Amino acid sequence: KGEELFTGVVPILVELDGDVNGHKFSVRGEGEGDATNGKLTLKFICTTGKLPVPWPTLVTTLVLCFARYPDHMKQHDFFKSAMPEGYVQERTISFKDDGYYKTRAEVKFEGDTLVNRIELKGIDFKEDGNILGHKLEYNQNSHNAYITADKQKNGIKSNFKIRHNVEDGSVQLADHYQQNTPIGDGPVLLPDNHYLSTQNALSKDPNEKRDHMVLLEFVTAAGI
């Protein structure tokens, strides 16, 4: 079973290649996951210098296999069942009254490390907007994302809204549409309807003057 690969603490690498309205950028990230506690600890750097979008808008793009599924729901953990082959995760994130991201990522094992390699394409962002205008508070609220299965594709799908805080007190909706597909041909467990609960703490490393985001995350499954 793929779960046994998440017994202890396993290392994580995240490589994102992005292009937003013609502004290209890379982001590298490193840390560790502890599935039995549903915990993520990670440092992220913009290796290409300054980041043309706010850090919160990438949190969802930058490894659901590290969610804690309670014992009474362990038969519904698709993300771990697809390991070590992995899965494809694709998204369109539609920021309300602004542009959108399209992302494609594969999440697999490369040796001992769980890795997330992402291509991201942003287009149609406004000039005076929250995104390119960098008007988002540097934090991330807690969200629930309702997971459901797609029988035809042999994976899961998910539709949820993220709510970013904008500096003047209003809220920037970011509509997520998600599909997940297994890479390998081994069997995978497909779940009954349930949600993932997510909590986030965004912060800065004081010995790091590069563009960066220290991220602490707790993801637990509930709903059955």
Side-chain angles (χ1 to χ4, degrees), residues 2-120 122-127 129-150 152-208 210-224:
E3 162 47 85
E4 313 139 354
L5 309 203
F6 299 89
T7 279
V9 170
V10 316
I12 304 170
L13 180 80
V14 185
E15 322 215 276
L16 171 131
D17 275 330
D19 179 13
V20 183
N21 278 21
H23 304 111
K24 300 198 188 58
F25 61 93
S26 286
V27 164
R28 189 190 182 273
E30 58 178 22
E32 33 179 86
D34 178 3
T36 88
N37 283 318
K39 174 188 275 223
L40 297 181
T41 87
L42 292 132
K43 193 186 192 174
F44 292 103
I45 320 283
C46 190
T47 50
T48 68
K50 165 101 183 138
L51 200 72
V53 309
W55 281 109
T57 69
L58 307 172
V59 172
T60 50
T61 292
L62 302 164
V63 286
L64 297 183
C65 42
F66 290 112
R68 177 162 104 140
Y69 274 76
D71 271 293
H72 71 279
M73 314 178 52
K74 271 249 166 35
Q75 299 336 293
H76 312 254
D77 189 342
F78 161 89
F79 313 93
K80 292 201 193 60
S81 90
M83 300 315 288
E85 307 267 52
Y87 51 84
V88 179
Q89 184 165 290
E90 290 166 350
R91 287 210 171 105
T92 88
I93 295 148
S94 172
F95 301 83
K96 175 137 147 299
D97 298 339
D98 204 318
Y100 65 87
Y101 303 161
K102 295 196 110 79
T103 68
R104 169 173 188 289
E106 28 187 296
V107 176
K108 75 221 83 61
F109 266 99
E110 293 174 6
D112 67 334
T113 304
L114 187 275
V115 308
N116 182 32
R117 206 168 271 107
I118 314 145
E119 273 177 359
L120 172 141
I123 54 56
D124 286 333
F125 284 87
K126 291 185 316 171
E127 212 252 14
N130 294 330
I131 311 297
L132 301 171
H134 291 269
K135 285 158 192 167
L136 290 197
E137 301 190 352
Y138 181 71
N139 55 52
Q140 185 90 328
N141 300 317
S142 307
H143 303 94
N144 300 335
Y146 264 86
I147 301 301
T148 191
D150 181 65
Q152 275 273 54
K153 200 101 194 267
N154 201 37
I156 56 93
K157 70 189 212 235
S158 173
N159 281 315
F160 61 92
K161 309 184 279 82
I162 293 291
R163 332 222 193 220
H164 300 301
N165 303 316
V166 317
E167 308 172 306
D168 69 355
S170 52
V171 169
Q172 167 81 65
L173 289 204
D175 216 345
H176 290 58
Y177 302 83
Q178 170 174 341
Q179 335 161 58
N180 291 77
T181 325
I183 297 176
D185 281 62
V188 296
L189 296 129
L190 288 85
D192 280 346
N193 282 200
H194 68 281
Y195 71 86
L196 292 188
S197 162
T198 292
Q199 287 134 115
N200 312 101
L202 271 69
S203 76
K204 305 278 190 196
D205 169 30
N207 315 347
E208 180 57 85
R210 301 195 265 177
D211 213 347
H212 73 287
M213 167 175 82
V214 173
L215 189 54
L216 222 302
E217 187 157 305
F218 285 110
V219 187
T220 66
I224 300 175

Coordinates of all heavy atoms in Angstrom, one line a residue, residues 4-66:
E4 N 2.1 3.2 3.6 CA 3.3 2.8 4.3 C 4.5 3.7 4.0 O 5.4 3.9 4.8 CB 3.7 1.4 4.0 CG 2.5 0.4 4.2 CD 2.6 -0.6 3.1 OE1 3.4 -0.6 2.2 OE2 1.7 -1.6 3.1
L5 N 4.5 4.3 2.8 CA 5.5 5.3 2.4 C 5.4 6.6 3.2 O 6.4 7.4 3.1 CB 5.4 5.6 0.9 CG 5.4 4.5 -0.2 CD1 5.8 5.0 -1.5 CD2 6.2 3.3 0.3
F6 N 4.3 6.8 3.9 CA 4.1 8.0 4.7 C 4.1 7.8 6.2 O 3.5 8.6 7.0 CB 2.8 8.7 4.3 CG 2.8 9.1 2.8 CD1 2.4 8.3 1.8 CD2 3.3 10.4 2.4 CE1 2.4 8.6 0.5 CE2 3.3 10.7 1.1 CZ 2.9 9.9 0.1
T7 N 4.7 6.7 6.6 CA 4.7 6.3 8.1 C 5.5 7.4 8.9 O 4.9 7.9 9.9 CB 5.4 5.0 8.2 OG1 4.4 4.0 8.0 CG2 5.9 4.8 9.7
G8 N 6.7 7.7 8.5 CA 7.5 8.7 9.2 C 7.4 10.1 8.6 O 6.4 10.5 8.1
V9 N 8.6 10.7 8.6 CA 8.7 12.1 8.1 C 9.5 12.0 6.8 O 10.7 11.5 6.8 CB 9.5 13.0 9.1 CG1 9.9 14.3 8.5 CG2 8.6 13.2 10.3
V10 N 8.9 12.5 5.7 CA 9.6 12.3 4.4 C 9.9 13.7 3.8 O 9.1 14.6 4.0 CB 8.7 11.4 3.4 CG1 8.2 10.2 4.2 CG2 7.7 12.2 2.7
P11 N 10.9 13.8 3.0 CA 11.3 15.1 2.5 C 10.6 15.5 1.2 O 10.0 14.6 0.5 CB 12.8 15.0 2.2 CG 13.0 13.5 1.9 CD 11.9 12.8 2.7
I12 N 10.5 16.8 1.0 CA 9.6 17.4 -0.1 C 10.4 18.4 -0.9 O 11.2 19.2 -0.3 CB 8.4 18.0 0.5 CG1 7.6 17.0 1.4 CG2 7.5 18.6 -0.5 CD1 6.5 17.7 2.2
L13 N 10.3 18.3 -2.2 CA 10.9 19.3 -3.1 C 9.8 19.8 -4.0 O 8.9 19.0 -4.5 CB 12.0 18.7 -4.0 CG 12.7 19.6 -5.0 CD1 13.8 20.5 -4.3 CD2 13.4 18.8 -6.1
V14 N 9.8 21.1 -4.2 CA 8.8 21.7 -5.1 C 9.5 22.6 -6.1 O 10.2 23.6 -5.8 CB 7.8 22.6 -4.3 CG1 6.6 23.1 -5.2 CG2 7.2 21.7 -3.1
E15 N 9.2 22.3 -7.4 CA 9.8 23.1 -8.5 C 8.6 23.6 -9.3 O 7.8 22.9 -9.9 CB 10.8 22.3 -9.3 CG 11.6 21.3 -8.5 CD 13.1 21.2 -9.1 OE1 13.2 20.4 -10.0 OE2 14.0 21.8 -8.6
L16 N 8.4 25.0 -9.3 CA 7.4 25.6 -10.1 C 8.0 26.5 -11.1 O 8.9 27.3 -10.8 CB 6.5 26.5 -9.2 CG 5.5 27.3 -10.0 CD1 4.1 27.2 -9.5 CD2 6.0 28.8 -10.0
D17 N 7.6 26.3 -12.4 CA 7.9 27.2 -13.5 C 6.7 28.0 -13.9 O 5.7 27.4 -14.4 CB 8.5 26.4 -14.6 CG 10.0 26.2 -14.4 OD1 10.7 27.0 -13.8 OD2 10.5 25.1 -14.9
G18 N 6.7 29.3 -13.8 CA 5.6 30.1 -14.0 C 5.8 31.2 -15.1 O 6.9 31.6 -15.4
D19 N 4.6 31.6 -15.7 CA 4.6 32.6 -16.7 C 3.3 33.4 -16.5 O 2.2 32.8 -16.9 CB 4.8 32.1 -18.1 CG 4.8 33.2 -19.2 OD1 4.8 34.4 -18.8 OD2 4.6 32.9 -20.4
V20 N 3.3 34.6 -16.0 CA 2.1 35.4 -15.8 C 2.2 36.6 -16.6 O 3.0 37.5 -16.4 CB 2.0 35.7 -14.3 CG1 0.7 36.5 -14.1 CG2 2.0 34.5 -13.5
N21 N 1.3 36.7 -17.6 CA 1.2 37.9 -18.5 C 2.6 38.2 -19.1 O 3.0 39.3 -19.3 CB 0.7 39.1 -17.8 CG -0.8 39.2 -17.7 OD1 -1.5 38.1 -17.9 ND2 -1.4 40.4 -17.6
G22 N 3.4 37.1 -19.4 CA 4.7 37.3 -20.0 C 5.8 37.5 -19.0 O 7.0 37.6 -19.4
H23 N 5.5 37.5 -17.7 CA 6.5 37.6 -16.7 C 6.8 36.2 -16.2 O 6.0 35.6 -15.5 CB 6.1 38.5 -15.5 CG 5.7 39.9 -15.9 ND1 4.4 40.3 -15.8 CD2 6.5 40.9 -16.4 CE1 4.4 41.6 -16.3 NE2 5.6 41.9 -16.6
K24 N 8.0 35.7 -16.5 CA 8.5 34.4 -16.1 C 9.1 34.4 -14.7 O 9.7 35.4 -14.3 CB 9.4 33.8 -17.2 CG 8.9 33.7 -18.6 CD 9.7 32.7 -19.4 CE 9.2 32.8 -20.9 NZ 9.3 34.2 -21.4
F25 N 9.1 33.3 -14.0 CA 9.7 33.1 -12.7 C 9.7 31.7 -12.3 O 8.9 30.9 -12.7 CB 8.9 34.0 -11.7 CG 7.4 33.5 -11.5 CD1 7.1 32.6 -10.5 CD2 6.4 34.0 -12.3 CE1 5.7 32.2 -10.4 CE2 5.1 33.7 -12.2 CZ 4.8 32.7 -11.2
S26 N 10.7 31.4 -11.5 CA 10.9 30.0 -10.9 C 10.7 30.1 -9.4 O 11.1 31.2 -8.7 CB 12.3 29.4 -11.2 OG 12.3 29.0 -12.5
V27 N 10.3 29.0 -8.8 CA 10.2 28.9 -7.3 C 10.6 27.5 -6.9 O 10.1 26.5 -7.4 CB 8.8 29.2 -6.8 CG1 8.6 28.7 -5.3 CG2 8.5 30.7 -6.8
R28 N 11.6 27.5 -6.0 CA 12.1 26.2 -5.4 C 11.7 26.1 -4.0 O 11.8 27.1 -3.2 CB 13.6 26.1 -5.6 CG 14.1 24.7 -5.2 CD 15.6 24.6 -5.1 NE 16.1 23.3 -4.8 CZ 16.2 22.8 -3.5 NH1 15.9 23.6 -2.5 NH2 16.7 21.6 -3.3
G29 N 11.3 25.0 -3.5 CA 10.9 24.8 -2.1 C 11.3 23.5 -1.5 O 11.4 22.5 -2.2
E30 N 11.6 23.5 -0.2 CA 12.2 22.3 0.4 C 11.6 22.3 1.9 O 11.4 23.3 2.5 CB 13.7 22.3 0.5 CG 14.3 23.6 1.1 CD 15.8 23.6 1.2 OE1 16.5 22.9 0.4 OE2 16.4 24.3 2.1
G31 N 11.5 21.0 2.4 CA 11.0 20.8 3.7 C 10.6 19.4 3.9 O 11.2 18.5 3.3
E32 N 9.6 19.1 4.8 CA 9.3 17.8 5.1 C 7.8 17.6 5.5 O 7.2 18.6 5.9 CB 10.1 17.3 6.3 CG 10.5 18.4 7.3 CD 11.3 17.8 8.5 OE1 12.5 17.7 8.4 OE2 10.6 17.5 9.6
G33 N 7.3 16.5 5.2 CA 5.9 16.2 5.5 C 5.8 15.1 6.5 O 6.6 14.2 6.6
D34 N 4.7 15.1 7.3 CA 4.4 14.1 8.3 C 2.9 13.8 8.2 O 2.1 14.5 8.8 CB 4.8 14.6 9.7 CG 4.5 13.6 10.8 OD1 4.0 12.5 10.5 OD2 4.7 13.9 12.0
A35 N 2.6 12.8 7.5 CA 1.2 12.5 7.2 C 0.4 12.1 8.4 O -0.7 12.6 8.6 CB 1.1 11.3 6.2
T36 N 1.0 11.3 9.3 CA 0.2 10.9 10.5 C -0.2 12.0 11.3 O -1.2 11.9 12.0 CB 1.0 9.8 11.3 OG1 1.8 10.5 12.3 CG2 1.9 9.0 10.4
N37 N 0.5 13.2 11.3 CA 0.1 14.4 11.9 C -0.5 15.4 10.9 O -0.8 16.6 11.3 CB 1.3 15.0 12.7 CG 1.6 14.3 14.0 OD1 0.6 14.0 14.7 ND2 2.8 14.0 14.3
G38 N -0.6 15.1 9.6 CA -1.0 16.0 8.6 C -0.3 17.3 8.6 O -0.9 18.4 8.6
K39 N 1.1 17.3 8.7 CA 1.9 18.5 8.9 C 2.8 18.8 7.7 O 3.4 17.9 7.2 CB 2.7 18.5 10.2 CG 3.6 19.6 10.4 CD 4.6 19.4 11.6 CE 3.9 19.8 12.9 NZ 4.9 20.6 13.8
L40 N 2.9 20.1 7.3 CA 3.9 20.5 6.3 C 4.7 21.7 6.8 O 4.1 22.6 7.4 CB 3.1 20.9 5.0 CG 2.3 19.9 4.2 CD1 1.7 20.5 3.0 CD2 3.2 18.7 3.9
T41 N 6.0 21.6 6.7 CA 6.9 22.6 7.0 C 7.8 22.9 5.8 O 8.5 21.9 5.3 CB 7.8 22.3 8.2 OG1 9.0 21.6 7.7 CG2 7.1 21.5 9.2
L42 N 7.9 24.1 5.2 CA 8.5 24.3 4.0 C 9.0 25.7 3.8 O 8.3 26.7 4.2 CB 7.5 24.0 2.8 CG 7.1 22.5 2.6 CD1 5.6 22.4 2.5 CD2 7.8 21.9 1.4
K43 N 10.2 25.9 3.3 CA 10.7 27.2 2.8 C 10.6 27.2 1.3 O 11.0 26.3 0.6 CB 12.2 27.4 3.3 CG 12.7 28.8 3.1 CD 14.1 28.9 3.5 CE 14.6 30.3 3.6 NZ 16.0 30.4 4.1
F44 N 10.1 28.4 0.8 CA 10.0 28.6 -0.7 C 10.9 29.8 -1.1 O 10.7 30.9 -0.4 CB 8.6 28.8 -1.1 CG 7.7 27.6 -1.0 CD1 6.8 27.5 0.0 CD2 7.8 26.6 -1.9 CE1 6.0 26.4 0.2 CE2 7.0 25.5 -1.8 CZ 6.1 25.4 -0.8
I45 N 11.7 29.7 -2.1 CA 12.4 30.8 -2.7 C 12.0 31.1 -4.1 O 11.8 30.1 -4.9 CB 14.0 30.7 -2.6 CG1 14.4 30.0 -1.3 CG2 14.6 32.0 -2.8 CD1 14.4 31.0 -0.1
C46 N 11.9 32.3 -4.5 CA 11.9 32.7 -5.9 C 13.3 32.8 -6.4 O 14.1 33.7 -6.2 CB 11.2 34.1 -6.1 SG 10.8 34.6 -7.8
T47 N 13.8 31.7 -7.1 CA 15.1 31.7 -7.6 C 15.5 32.7 -8.6 O 16.6 33.2 -8.7 CB 15.5 30.3 -8.1 OG1 14.5 29.8 -9.0 CG2 15.5 29.3 -6.9
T48 N 14.4 33.2 -9.4 CA 14.6 34.2 -10.4 C 14.5 35.6 -9.8 O 14.2 36.6 -10.6 CB 13.6 34.0 -11.5 OG1 12.3 34.3 -11.0 CG2 13.6 32.6 -12.1
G49 N 14.7 35.8 -8.5 CA 14.6 37.2 -7.9 C 13.3 37.6 -7.4 O 12.8 36.9 -6.4
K50 N 12.7 38.6 -7.9 CA 11.4 39.1 -7.4 C 10.2 38.4 -8.1 O 10.3 38.0 -9.2 CB 11.3 40.6 -7.7 CG 9.9 41.2 -7.6 CD 9.6 41.9 -6.2 CE 8.2 42.4 -6.2 NZ 7.5 42.2 -4.8
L51 N 9.2 38.1 -7.3 CA 8.0 37.4 -7.7 C 7.0 38.3 -8.2 O 6.6 39.2 -7.5 CB 7.5 36.5 -6.6 CG 6.6 35.3 -6.9 CD1 7.4 34.1 -7.5 CD2 5.9 34.8 -5.6
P52 N 6.4 38.1 -9.4 CA 5.5 39.1 -10.0 C 4.1 39.0 -9.5 O 3.2 39.9 -9.8 CB 5.5 38.8 -11.5 CG 5.9 37.3 -11.6 CD 6.7 37.0 -10.4
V53 N 3.8 38.0 -8.7 CA 2.4 37.8 -8.1 C 2.6 37.7 -6.6 O 3.8 37.5 -6.1 CB 1.7 36.5 -8.6 CG1 1.8 36.5 -10.2 CG2 2.4 35.3 -8.1
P54 N 1.6 37.9 -5.8 CA 1.7 37.7 -4.3 C 1.8 36.2 -4.0 O 1.1 35.4 -4.6 CB 0.4 38.3 -3.8 CG -0.1 39.3 -4.9 CD 0.3 38.5 -6.1
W55 N 2.7 36.0 -3.0 CA 2.9 34.6 -2.5 C 1.6 33.8 -2.1 O 1.5 32.7 -2.5 CB 3.8 34.7 -1.2 CG 5.2 34.8 -1.5 CD1 6.0 36.0 -1.4 CD2 6.0 33.8 -2.1 NE1 7.3 35.7 -1.8 CE2 7.3 34.4 -2.3 CE3 5.8 32.5 -2.5 CZ2 8.4 33.7 -2.8 CZ3 6.9 31.8 -3.0 CH2 8.2 32.4 -3.2
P56 N 0.7 34.4 -1.4 CA -0.6 33.7 -1.1 C -1.2 33.1 -2.3 O -1.8 32.0 -2.2 CB -1.5 34.7 -0.5 CG -0.6 35.7 0.2 CD 0.7 35.7 -0.7
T57 N -1.2 33.7 -3.5 CA -1.9 33.2 -4.7 C -1.3 31.9 -5.2 O -2.0 31.2 -5.9 CB -1.9 34.2 -5.9 OG1 -0.6 34.4 -6.4 CG2 -2.5 35.5 -5.4
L58 N -0.1 31.5 -4.8 CA 0.6 30.3 -5.1 C 0.5 29.2 -4.1 O 0.8 28.0 -4.4 CB 2.0 30.5 -5.5 CG 2.3 31.7 -6.5 CD1 3.8 32.0 -6.6 CD2 1.8 31.3 -7.8
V59 N 0.0 29.5 -2.9 CA 0.0 28.5 -1.8 C -0.7 27.2 -2.3 O -0.2 26.1 -2.1 CB -0.7 29.0 -0.5 CG1 -0.9 27.9 0.5 CG2 0.1 30.1 0.1
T60 N -1.9 27.3 -2.9 CA -2.6 26.1 -3.3 C -1.8 25.4 -4.4 O -1.9 24.1 -4.5 CB -4.0 26.4 -3.8 OG1 -4.1 27.5 -4.8 CG2 -5.0 26.7 -2.6
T61 N -1.1 26.1 -5.3 CA -0.4 25.4 -6.4 C 0.9 24.7 -5.8 O 1.1 23.6 -6.1 CB 0.1 26.4 -7.4 OG1 -1.1 26.9 -8.1 CG2 1.0 25.8 -8.4
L62 N 1.6 25.4 -5.0 CA 2.8 24.8 -4.4 C 2.5 23.7 -3.4 O 3.3 22.8 -3.3 CB 3.6 25.9 -3.6 CG 4.1 27.1 -4.4 CD1 4.5 28.3 -3.5 CD2 5.2 26.8 -5.3
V63 N 0.5 19.2 -2.4 CA 0.9 17.8 -2.0 C -0.1 17.3 -1.0 O 0.2 17.1 0.2 CB 2.4 17.8 -1.5 CG1 3.4 17.9 -2.6 CG2 2.6 18.8 -0.4
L64 N -1.3 16.9 -1.5 CA -2.4 16.5 -0.7 C -2.1 15.1 -0.1 O -2.9 14.7 0.8 CB -3.7 16.5 -1.4 CG -4.2 17.9 -1.9 CD1 -5.5 17.8 -2.6 CD2 -4.2 18.9 -0.8
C65 N -1.1 14.4 -0.6 CA -0.8 13.0 0.0 C -0.4 13.1 1.4 O -0.4 12.1 2.1 CB 0.3 12.4 -0.9 SG 1.6 13.5 -1.4
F66 N -0.1 14.3 2.0 CA 0.3 14.5 3.3 C -0.9 14.9 4.2 O -0.6 15.3 5.4 CB 1.4 15.6 3.4 CG 2.7 15.1 2.9 CD1 3.3 15.6 1.7 CD2 3.4 14.1 3.5 CE1 4.5 15.2 1.2 CE2 4.6 13.6 3.0 CZ 5.1 14.1 1.8

